[PDB]
């Protein structure tokens, strides 16, 4: 369909991020300046947030056969933009330690944010596929940005090969779904069925291959083995972006796909997703038990937390507040992961070159970085689902949503995985305060410290008083 000016108003964050990509690229073409290009990128992302306010002042409508903009899309756009802004802020000191070109980083972060926004508004299989690829390829660049280092090149090769394979799986599944149902829009996948014929074998096989691709992207068992290697090998701001923005955007488009598709309330797909959620929770928590590397530990943590989110997704076509639970949990998980990966990024910045080691060495962090240790232990308590943290509010939402839908196996899985998480998260948070024998001064490092401190304060305050976040998420509802 044609694009009216109101439709152009509803595309405002997408347009502003694309224009920021063009402007930053032309500025690099003018002169290779780190500060100006980083500033232009963060100005473009903040302008995209203000454009989200302007989009909210407009209506909720279908801008294309491809895109649909509503409060759901606005919430996920805001989450992706916050994650991208935090990634740029954490990236500046680390890139200040870098030696090669250091503005293509911000260009790639902007293009990945553009893909996240497209997935936030995606109402079509074409827009879903394109948003996944626009997330993925800049992350191929960003994970191997320090390709002279062995670990970053290894993580880049693994992520590139496995994401190309997963995109092939997703595209073949989309092709089988389109072979069954003549339309590629979300609301028409399974529409031409009735009288108990919703489980068409070709439609289920197509959704299975799409589940393979998306479950690679979400680090769900058994498509999870890439996660600790890529999280450990990637640069720490890249690990921050990969943990927050990619997972949030892909899970949002999966939420909308299962909300809108008439095949979403299928018993077979629900049982398969229940198996995947159970295995993801238990396996991620069990594999994170004996990890001394903080980044591998957060990779397995991401596996288990996406399992909890999947549990909230399974109850979507039965209950009502599954969308609200996913929103609250995703806000809490975003802020906790931003704090944890930002502490990891700040202590690993500036970049020490490809030859020097990059181990975190979090033991006894309090005796020389007390504020970062306090932020890190708040984040470790939040990822554990401890009360007085927003992670507990998300976990409580997941438990309430599971109890309402009689998903008792998943409820018991959440309880057991939470106990295992208690063990390893408390191990990290108490190793922060022990005594270690042995083993800045610019405002961008201070900006990263302020970002992790504000994330910690948000986690604590919204864990004590979660009503504002619930009220914000509840008014961000999609088209029914």
């Amino acid at each position: 369909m044609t694009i009216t000016p109101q439709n152009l108003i509803a595309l405002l964050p997408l347009l502003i991020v694309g224009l920021t990509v063009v402007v930053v690229m032309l500025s690099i073409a003018w002169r290779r300046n780190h500060f100006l290009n980083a500033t232009l990128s963060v100005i473009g992302l903040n302008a995209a947030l203000v454009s989200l306010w302007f989009v909210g002042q407009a209506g909720a409508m279908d801008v294309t056969p491809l895109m649909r903009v509503d409060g759901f899309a606005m919430l996920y756009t805001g989450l992706v933009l916050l994650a991208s802004l935090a990634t740029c802020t954490f990236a500046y000191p680390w890139l200040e330690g870098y030696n090669d070109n250091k503005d293509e980083f911000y260009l790639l972060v902007l293009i990945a944010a553009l893909g996240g926004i497209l997935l936030a508004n995606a109402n079509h299989l074409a827009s879903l596929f394109l948003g996944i690829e626009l997330i993925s390829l800049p992350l191929f660049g960003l994970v191997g940005y320090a390709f002279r280092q062995k670990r970053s090149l290894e993580a880049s090769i693994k992520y590139t090969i496995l994401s190309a394979a997963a995109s092939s799986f997703l595209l073949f599944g989309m092709a089988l779904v389109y072979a069954q149902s003549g339309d590629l829009s979300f609301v028409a996948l399974g529409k031409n069925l009735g009288d108990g014929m919703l489980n068409e074998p070709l439609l289920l096989a197509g959704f299975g291959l799409m589940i393979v691709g998306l479950g690679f992207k979400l680090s769900l068992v058994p498509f999870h083995l890439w996660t600790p290697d890529v999280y450990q090998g990637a640069p720490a701001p890249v690990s921050t972006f990969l943990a927050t923005a990619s997972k949030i955007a892909i899970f949002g488009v999966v939420m909308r796909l299962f909300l809108y598709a008439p095949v979403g309330d299928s018993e077979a797909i629900r049982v398969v997703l229940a198996i995947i959620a159970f295995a993801s929770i238990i396996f991620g928590n069990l594999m994170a038990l004996s990890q001394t590397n903080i980044k591998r530990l957060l990779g397995y943590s991401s596996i288990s937390h996406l399992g909890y989110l999947l549990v909230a997704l399974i109850a979507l076509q039965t209950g009502e507040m599954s969308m609200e639970a996913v929103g609250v949990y995703l806000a809490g998980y975003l802020f906790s992961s931003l704090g944890a990966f930002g502490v990891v990024s700040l202590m690993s910045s500036p970049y020490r070159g490809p030859d020097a080691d990059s181990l975190f060495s979090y033991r006894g962090l309090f005796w020389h970085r007390p504020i970062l240790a306090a932020v890190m232990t708040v984040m470790m308590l939040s990822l554990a689902g401890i009360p007085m943290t927003l992670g507990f509010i998300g976990k409580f939402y997941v438990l309430a949503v599971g109890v309402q839908a009689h998903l008792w196996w998943l409820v018991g899985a959440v309880v057991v995985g939470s106990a295992i998480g208690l063990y390893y998260y408390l191990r990290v948070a108490v190793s922060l305060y022990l005594h270690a024998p042995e083993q800045p001064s610019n405002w961008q490092y201070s900006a990263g410290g302020i970002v992790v401190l504000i994330s910690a304060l948000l986690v604590l305050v919204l864990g004590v008083w979660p009503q504002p976040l619930i009220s914000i998420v509840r008014l961000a509802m999609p088209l029914m």
């Binding site: 308590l381 007085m388 109890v403 106990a419 108490v430 009503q467 509840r474």
Partner: protein, 504 residues
């Protein structure tokens, strides 16, 4: 209106203890003392003005004081506090033990002392919030909120003679036990709230409205089992007791941390307030299993206490056996056994506080806890062995101390309800005398078994001696004149019992 201040004065006091460390390294102890004294004074003022002795039973709900303020209105969650006689007795007891814990941390002045006092005050405020909250989410929030300062007190400020990894192991075991049991309770709470929402149509976590929720016997049994698992971890009920002696042994060696966090029994109160009224039919069906678990707890705790070579683990298993007696008392339908349970909870608090303070003083004098390395200490110390003799005599169940009053009222009511269990439990009293005399013989009587015991040790200070003598006076007065406590708890206990027996 004073209940929010009963919770908030410990939190504000802990924050001021943390902040006023810059004014001096020996400053925050005075702030902690002042705030715990303020909390105790406010509890005593609520006791005096409440008129609990003249209150007659009128049925649940019946609150002497109440406070309500919306917290999460989406789920119908509100900060909803209420106090009656049982909650008031528990709040006065935790205020008194908090003052004792501040006084026991005196003359331990190191770096980050203000954060130690902050953790202590937050544990105490969480305990008070557990005793005051009468909606499910706030009760669960206070139930799980105590575990983080407790974990960091055990792991970071713990027993300095340990390996360092043993303290972390004990603290992690405690945290995993209590938090997993709490999560099971949260599942039971959420399922009860959803059953009520399907039955009526309005979201609520309020305890008053969640009463008389129509549900089948199996669902009610499952909800009762979730609540009981959470309370049975912290009661402790065997086999879920294993966190307790490890948490006591690896606790900070002043002994104040035991009184602040481990010594009090919020789980018996939790059973009385949220298990019998919310699920009376399920509790009535579960009563034989719970009473046999109590008998097993009595005998297992006595046998474990006899076999210890460490004093702190001996006192911990003593606590396990006494809580087995209380657990037997709770699942009867006797007002007399419930009053005995209340007296036994208070008496166990006083006697275990005295025993743990005396053990901490003995350890700071002889630098070991092994009873094989100590002996003949009656001839070497001035005050400690005689007071330890008194407190072992009190935990034995001696008439003249409140432990006897509580235990024998429990046994009288239980014999009126279940005679065989009462017979076996009185033989458990014989086993209690056996382990108390074993500890006294191994520690203070005989010949010295090492060179550290063959020396004259310094006497106790005036502060430690006076707070131990305060505990002695309180136990003796509770043994000889327990009537004010019974008159305080009578109306609440009668409400619980009449709700429990009229609905079955």
């Amino acid at each position: 209106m004073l209940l929010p201040w009963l919770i908030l004065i410990p939190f504000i006091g802990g924050f001021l203890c943390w902040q006023t460390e810059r004014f001096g390294v020996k400053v925050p102890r005075w702030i902690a003392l002042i705030t715990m004294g303020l909390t105790l004074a406010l509890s005593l003022q609520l006791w005096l003005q409440g008129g609990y002795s003249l209150t007659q039973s009128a049925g649940i709900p019946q609150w002497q004081s109440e406070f309500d303020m919306p917290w999460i209105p989406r789920f119908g969650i509100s900060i909803h506090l209420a106090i009656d006689g049982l909650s008031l007795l528990m709040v006065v007891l935790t205020g008194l033990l908090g003052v004792l814990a501040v006084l026991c941390s005196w003359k331990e002045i190191e770096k980050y002392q203000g954060f130690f006092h902050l953790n202590l005050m937050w544990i105490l405020g969480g305990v008070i919030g557990v005793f005051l909250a009468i909606d499910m989410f706030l009760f669960f929030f206070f139930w799980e909120m105590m575990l983080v300062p407790m974990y960091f007190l055990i792991a970071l400020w713990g027993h300095k003679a340990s390996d360092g990894k043993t303290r972390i192991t004990a603290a992690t075991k405690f945290f995993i036990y209590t938090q997993a049991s709490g999560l099971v309770m949260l599942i039971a709470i959420l399922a009860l709230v959803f059953v009520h929402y399907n039955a009526t149509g309005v979201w609520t976590f309020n305890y008053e409205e969640l009463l008389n929720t129509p549900m089948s016997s199996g669902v009610e049994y499952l909800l009762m089992l979730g609540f009981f698992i959470a309370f049975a971890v912290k009661m402790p009920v065997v086999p879920l007791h294993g966190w307790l002696p490890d948490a006591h042994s690896q606790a900070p060696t002043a002994g104040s941390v035991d009184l602040a966090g481990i010594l009090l029994k919020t789980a018996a109160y939790g059973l009385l307030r949220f298990s019998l009224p919310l699920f009376p039919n399920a509790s009535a069906e579960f009563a034989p299993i719970a009473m046999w678990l109590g008998v097993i707890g009595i005998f297992y705790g006595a046998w474990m206490a006899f076999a210890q070579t460490d004093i702190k683990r001996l006192i911990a298993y003593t606590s396990v056996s006494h809580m087995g007696f209380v657990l037997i008392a709770i699942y009867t339908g006797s007002q007399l056994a419930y009053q005995g349970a209340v007296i036994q909870m208070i008496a166990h608090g006083l006697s275990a506080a005295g025993l743990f303070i005396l053990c901490g003083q003995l350890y700071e004098r002889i630098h070991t806890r092994d009873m094989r390395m100590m002996g003949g200490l009656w001839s070497k110390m001035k005050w400690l062995p005689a007071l330890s003799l008194f407190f072992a005599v009190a935990t034995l169940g001696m008439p003249g101390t409140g432990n006897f009053v509580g235990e024998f009222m429990i046994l009288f009511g239980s014999f009126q309800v279940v005679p065989v269990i009462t017979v076996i439990s009185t033989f458990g009293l014989v086993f209690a005398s056996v382990y108390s005399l074993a500890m006294l013989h191994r520690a203070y009587f005989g010949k010295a078994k090492s060179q550290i015991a063959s020396q004259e040790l310094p006497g106790m200070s005036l502060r430690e001696l006076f707070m131990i003598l305060l505990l002695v006076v309180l136990l003796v007065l509770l043994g000889f004149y327990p009537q004010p406590i019974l008159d305080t708890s009578h109306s609440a206990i009668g409400n619980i019992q009449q709700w429990f027996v009229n609905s079955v």
